[PDB]
Write a protein that binds this ligand. Structure first.
Ligand SMILES: O=c1ccn([C@H]2C[C@H](O)[C@@H](COP(=O)(O)O)O2)c(=O)[nH]1
Ligand SMILES: O=c1ccn([C@H]2C[C@H](O)[C@@H](COP(=O)(O)O)O2)c(=O)[nH]1
Lengths: 316, 316
């Protein structure tokens, strides 16, 4: 099936992967260097062997495309995928006067019911961000996230470079260009970032009226990470094409350190016992073409019949 | 043999590649997305099926490692691989008072004996660079080349970031880091560069006391380009390891647009008729360890028994 390269990736680290310790203190069976490709004309690569929230993917992509870096847009669409980054900063600020959330990450997955007071404090933060502009502007804005890196690269002379926007015009004006690249790896920021980009960079390729895309992911969480990455960049590929009047080609995914967290073995093992189903169909708004002005309503996922979802203990 | 992934890469674009037009106006049979790996414990990947100048590779690597961006170092070692970039600029300057070298690139491979006056003018330039400091400093310095990008990344606040130097300390202090990256793709320079980096970025990986490296090459000339790239980055991998006290692992090579120029078909076809030989052995100076202070004398290539060299018409 369309999503077999995924399953195979997992099986290869399960069988061939080596134990290697990491940043976050769980263990991982990790390999280094791996490539897999999805021909996007056969269907959209949203895993069927496990239910994956397209809405979270869609809303996260649209946020990116807007050069938006404020968590408020996400919360508006019920996407809480990025909260903890803003929360981390909230806690470390003069204004925070509440139940000390030190290392809350570990201290929630752990036995103490820190998570009880955690979630209510988070609910407060989220509401503040959603309703108080001054607050939203203060802690709701992350700054150095993809949308910033894609649509507002800060140069030395102080200006802003719209990498993505430029790259698209280049594809229209020079389809056969071996320089269609968008990078997220700024060497002058990585050393002070909490999470340097996982999706380091991507490259477009046009040939035969087909638009392909290759994504280089320096680090990957096979079970929790990779499923999203695939649908996100396959969706990007579809959108950019919809604009450049091109047809959709393949989505090549290259990996640096592809790893499986030791606390995800049973989970991944269970998923591998499933038999893939016919992939879903993506349907974009024909009349609308400016992908930078798209909204949830313009992207329709069709025929998605996934197996139920596998719950998994997140690391940290 | 050790270098079989190379030959196979070529055969795949020969058989599976599609015709696609490019920047330089020759044609190319090109594919998009491809990965190959060389286990550096089996030998050094300097092609045997064709004679490849290790000296040019070695001297080019040492120049890089010095953060050197002046062609003078190269000319000193008889490496003329980068001349035409400095020449291009010489010609476009107020001071140049000589036989107009317009589009000399095309106009040399072509029928006119422009190349006659070209090579003597180049010989003059090269001598000026080699002997006159003011001149060397004016046109002999390229500025935005690898060594600059690796050892002197210019930030917004005006300073200089020693990416490579930092990355090495990181490997010593954090071997299991999924962030060991050195990038050459600055978004604020690419739009005005004559040749944006082909070797966009690379990533290190440590595990089991083995140091691996993955290189992402956005564009590749299978016949003329790739052979060098392999030996250059395999040598880099060996040097960095020699320093970090680590053992050498693999060299993974990932490609964006891997292409074969249409005027190289017979040449590549001939090379494929050859049977690989036992690869050579790299021998570094044990006593010397600071790779940034290495010189030609510290890198010994052993047992290199290559087939004669295949001459090939360079494109442009
Ligand atoms: O879309 C995403 C976001 C995060 N991660 C994972 C990758 C690593 O498991 C961890 C980041 O760790 P570092 O490699 O940066 O240390 O989060 C993913 O796999 N995919
Ligand atoms: O080490 C090198 C240097 C240059 N090139 C080639 C790649 C392309 O054939 C051309 C640069 O073309 P663009 O893709 O940038 O347009 O030179 C290589 O393959 N390897």
């Amino acid at each position: 099936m369309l999503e077999q390269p995924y399953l195979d990736l997992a099986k290869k680290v399960l069988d061939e992967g080596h134990f290697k310790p990491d940043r976050t203190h769980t263990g991982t069976y990790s390999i280094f260097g791996h490539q897999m490709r999805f021909d996007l004309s056969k269907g959209f690569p949203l895993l069927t062997t496990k239910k994956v929230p397209f809405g979270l993917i869609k809303s996260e992509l649209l946020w990116f495309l807007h050069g938006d870096t404020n968590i408020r847009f996400l919360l508006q669409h019920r996407n809480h995928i990025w909260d903890e980054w803003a929360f981390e900063k909230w806690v470390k600020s003069d204004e925070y006067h509440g139940p000390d959330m030190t290392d809350f990450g570990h201290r929630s997955q752990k036995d103490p019911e820190f998570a009880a007071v955690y979630h209510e404090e988070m609910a407060k933060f989220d509401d503040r961000v959603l309703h108080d502009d001054a607050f939203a502007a203060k802690y709701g804005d992350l700054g150095l996230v993809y949308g910033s890196q894609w649509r507002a690269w800060h140069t030395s002379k102080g200006d802003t470079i719209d990498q993505l926007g430029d790259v698209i015009e280049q594809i229209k004006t020079h389809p056969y260009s071996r320089r269609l690249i968008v990078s997220a790896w700024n060497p002058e920021d990585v050393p002070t970032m909490a999470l340097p980009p996982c999706h380091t960079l991507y490259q477009f390729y046009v040939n035969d009226g087909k638009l392909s895309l290759q994504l280089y992911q320096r680090s990957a969480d096979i079970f929790l990470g990779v499923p999203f990455s695939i649908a996100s960049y396959a969706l990007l590929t579809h959108l950019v094409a919809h604009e450049c009047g091109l047809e959709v080609g393949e989505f090549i995914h290259t990996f640096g350190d592809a790893h499986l967290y030791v606390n995800h073995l049973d989970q991944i093992k269970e998923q591998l016992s499933r038999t893939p189903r016919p992939a879903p169909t993506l349907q974009l708004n024909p009349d609308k073409h400016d992908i930078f002005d798209f909204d949830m309503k313009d992207i329709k996922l069709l025929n998605y019949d996934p197996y139920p979802a596998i719950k998994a203990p997140v690391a940290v």
